[PDB]
Amino acid sequence: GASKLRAVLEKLKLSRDDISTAAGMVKGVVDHLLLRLKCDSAFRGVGLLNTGSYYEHVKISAPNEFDVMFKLEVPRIQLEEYSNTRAYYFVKFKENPLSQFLEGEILSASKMLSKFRKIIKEEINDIKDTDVIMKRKRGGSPAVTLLISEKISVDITLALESKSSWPASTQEGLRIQNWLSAKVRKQLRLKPFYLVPKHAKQEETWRLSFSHIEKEILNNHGKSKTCCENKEEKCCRKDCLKLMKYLLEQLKERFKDKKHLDKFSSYHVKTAFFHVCTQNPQDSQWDRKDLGLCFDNCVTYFLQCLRTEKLENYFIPEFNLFSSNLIDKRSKEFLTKQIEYERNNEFPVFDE
């Protein structure tokens, strides 16, 4: 019930101070690293892009794991879609500071990746108890991992910043008109977009990223401009997204040996949550006193995506995150059985 869920949220608060304290450490090493690249290197126009769970105020676990994005302003970019993927692109340019990594017209992800990796190893040795370590490449993003005081892992993604208007594959995405309004949609789509190096599954492809927009929505999320700015307009949208993330995290924990749920990530949960916000656009559909109902809305929609094997990227609707090419049918059916069981029994995974 809604009291069991409120107890989970209270338990998650006990971890607030360790996450924020660790975020202070990350920021200290990141600003130091950033000012070496910024001063003099092949990545001079670099800048910090403050995105990810922590900056969205929905990081509720893993105080030793942070994702950080560096952005790189580039001269005007021309894109070329990789086959019919809708999310993966080759980068071209319409005498620029990236000429080093070009191969003909195409900007080489793996070459730029490789210099970035080396340039940071070189500047890291000069930084107090911080090292570079290699996790699974995952297509090139995260591009490099830092280990701060040999305790905190910081995954750092290099992202190109394009101030051009969004690619065609986003035209029907970001369907926030009935929720956040058409005015907000136009305003958000005048913002830049980002490209992160990412194998599409041998190629030099990049994938669109809209983390800065996901942060904007999450921190300005009501139909009312004053949603969550006073006690009469405290909604439970964020509490539901935190509970969805914690649900998945706790389920993955119960399979740490075989790791059957390894392919599922909080990005999947976050994408499904944005679709529910679109489907339930009124702030009264997220009254704090209806927490148990809104959480059920989030869980059944997430079950529906697993059963239909369809979870469309919130910005690129033809990019299906749950297609069998990415997540096999068997993993989705296994996660469906667990979540179904938990939903029908008032979430015994949350019992103390």
Ligand SMILES: [Zn+2]
């Ligand atoms: Zn709110």
